[PDB]
A = this chain, B = another copy of it.
Amino acid sequence: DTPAGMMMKFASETTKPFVDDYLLSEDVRDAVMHNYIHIHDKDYYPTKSLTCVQHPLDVILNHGFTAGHGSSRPAKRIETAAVLACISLETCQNEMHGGQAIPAFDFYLAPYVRMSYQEEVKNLEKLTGEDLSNLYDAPIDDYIEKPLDGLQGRERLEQHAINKTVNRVHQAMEAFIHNMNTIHSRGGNQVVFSSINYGTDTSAEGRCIMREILQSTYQGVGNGETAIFPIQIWKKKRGVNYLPEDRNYDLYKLACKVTARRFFPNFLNLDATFNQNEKWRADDPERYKWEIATMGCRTRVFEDRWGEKTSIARGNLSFSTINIVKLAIECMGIENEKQRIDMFFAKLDNILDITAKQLDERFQFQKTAMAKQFPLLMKYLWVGAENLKPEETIESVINHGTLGIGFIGLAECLVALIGKHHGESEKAQELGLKIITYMRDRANEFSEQYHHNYSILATPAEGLSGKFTKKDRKQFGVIPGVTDRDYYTNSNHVPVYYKCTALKKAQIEAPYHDLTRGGHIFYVEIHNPSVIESVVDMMDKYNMGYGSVNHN
């Protein structure tokens, strides 16, 4: 409705009918035209843009960043460090069509908590004059606060100096939450996606910054208002937290209390046998670079078939969703069950072949793009973008991305077309695991022949919640139990209308997580912080992954 918002749809409605006939081959055109394959984010097809990336902020903060004609200096304070983090999330958004996230936010804001107070003792000293050159190289327990009830001594300056950074850190983090919640900079939707990760830092500086993050979030933004960004993620690796005899167990009790109030902080299971790495040293500082860090878009980039297994600076190239619900309708006329399942696999075989080539054609289109089109994404943020001339091509470093073959309505696929769905049916549970394994096995075959990184993704319900259903419903009238819901259920998720307990959902949805390596989420909808620990307790027994709790 805004002048900037209405300008974007003029370009979209112009460039969307253009790409259909002048960029696609005849076979993919018919498959796309016949409502079989969906191309996510087709508006930016000519621009040759990528999906997302995990922001490395340690490099940006230590040297600043110069995008366009705007330049900045390295941060030397808590206020300067937090504010520059927001800008790094604002410039890159205009160069992509997805979202941003901060991996291990705790580690980044920790030297400057000390450094803002390290030189503060030199300003609190000149009033007195005594050479107090010992307030930095000492083991601080928690950067604690006191009621200031008649403190007295020479070392009263030592307690006053540390008292100066706790208030300043609290003020510093208020800027970060407000900046990412009120600055409308993106074209169109006018909101920049963001996400941060914290919960696995135990140092004195890290414990202070993590507490204030929870303390500031407990208060809100402006006047007692829950923030929408950034999305909060909590780590629960065993041996650092989640155990009573742990250094960070005290904050974990507070974190569940904050979650009970604002419902913002999500949890990530670092013990899943696929969210697990062999290079986690307990003593090496900055425990990131070998951990799992997700986003708000259920995007998971962990294992690379050519490179290193990490989630830093990587992301998706582009992903397409395959309508498997439609294929079952065409095979509903076969009387013999063995023949019926034979046809569905044959029909699924043809669509999968086109989609692998369909993603391959868009990949070839994107590799010709120049690095000058992404001033910040292809300069500091991407994996191998530190050496890329503006006039070069992205074909060298574009391979460290994920092409996603997603699906929708697995429950809708089997609810009435083939018997029952994967809820109150053990036979359908075996059938459902067979199909996803069939897609997973084919994606392995596509990876060998097309030489890419194909993964099965649980596509978030955003932009494709009702598009598929309406088009197919008209073609096939009213199919009872399938095309009478106006929305297809999300990937490998128990349908909402099927009543079940949290324990039962954990058991049913656990096996799918090892299959959908491209992204998954566990959703629990429902005061006491303990009940939050119940979710991670059941997530502990069964190998699951990313988890979230909502109220609505």
Q: Is B97 in contact with A3, judged by CB distance below 8 angstroms?
A: yes
Q: Is B3 in contact with A49, judged by CB distance below 8 angstroms?
A: yes
Q: Is A148 in contact with B126, judged by CB distance below 8 angstroms?
A: yes
A534 at the interface (CB under 8 A from B): no
A282 at the interface (CB under 8 A from B): no
A70 at the interface (CB under 8 A from B): yes
List A residues 159-205 near B (Cβ within 8 Å): 160, 175, 178, 181-191
Residue tally, chain A, CB below 8 Å to B: 66
Which one of B7, B72, B221 lies within 8 Å of A71 (CB-CB)?
B221
Instruction: Please name all residues of chain B whose beta carbon is closer than 8 Å to the beta carbon of A7 when the two chains form the complex.
Output: 8, 11-12, 15, 44, 47, 187, 189
A536 at the interface (CB under 8 A from B): no
A477 at the interface (CB under 8 A from B): no
Interface string of A71-99 (1 = CB under 8 A from B): 11100000100010001001101111100
Instruction: Please name all residues of chain B whose beta carbon is closer than 8 Å to the beta carbon of A243 when the two chains form the complex.
Output: none
A541 at the interface (CB under 8 A from B): no
When A2-B374, A14-B10, A14-B11 are in contact, do A69 and B185 touch as well, CB less than 8 Å?
yes
Q: Is B66 in contact with A222, judged by CB distance below 8 angstroms?
A: yes
A296 at the interface (CB under 8 A from B): no
Q: Is A90 in contact with B188, judged by CB distance below 8 angstroms?
A: no
Q: How far is the CB of A390 from chain B (nearest CB, A)?
A: 9
Which one of B49, B70, B181 lies within 8 Å of A221 (CB-CB)?
B70
Of the candidates A90, A97, A184, A373, the one having the most CB atoms from chain B within 10 angstroms of its own CB is A184
Could you say how many copies of this chain the assembly holds? 2
Q: Is B11 in contact with A70, judged by CB distance below 8 angstroms?
A: no
A46 at the interface (CB under 8 A from B): yes
A127 at the interface (CB under 8 A from B): yes
Q: Is B188 in contact with A70, judged by CB distance below 8 angstroms?
A: no
List A residues 284-318 near B (Cβ within 8 Å): none
Instruction: Please name all residues of chain B whose beta carbon is closer than 8 Å to the beta carbon of A4 when the two chains form the complex.
Output: 94-95, 187-190
Which one of B2, B79, B94, B148 lies within 8 Å of A94 (CB-CB)?
B2
Instruction: Please name all residues of chain B whose beta carbon is closer than 8 Å to the beta carbon of A97 when the two chains form the complex.
Output: 3
A375 at the interface (CB under 8 A from B): yes
Instruction: Please name all residues of chain B whose beta carbon is closer than 8 Å to the beta carbon of A228 when the two chains form the complex.
Output: 69
Instruction: Please name all residues of chain B whose beta carbon is closer than 8 Å to the beta carbon of A495 when the two chains form the complex.
Output: none
Which one of B48, B72, B188, B225 lies within 8 Å of A186 (CB-CB)?
B188
A467 at the interface (CB under 8 A from B): no
Q: Which residues of A contact B (CB under 8 A)?
A: 1-4, 6-8, 10-15, 44, 46-49, 64, 66-73, 79, 83, 87, 90-91, 93-97, 126-127, 148, 156-157, 160, 175, 178, 181-191, 221-223, 225, 228, 370, 372-375
Instruction: Report the 5 A-B pairs with minimum CB-CB distance, sorted nearest first.
Output: A71-B222, A68-B185, A187-B188, A70-B182, A70-B185
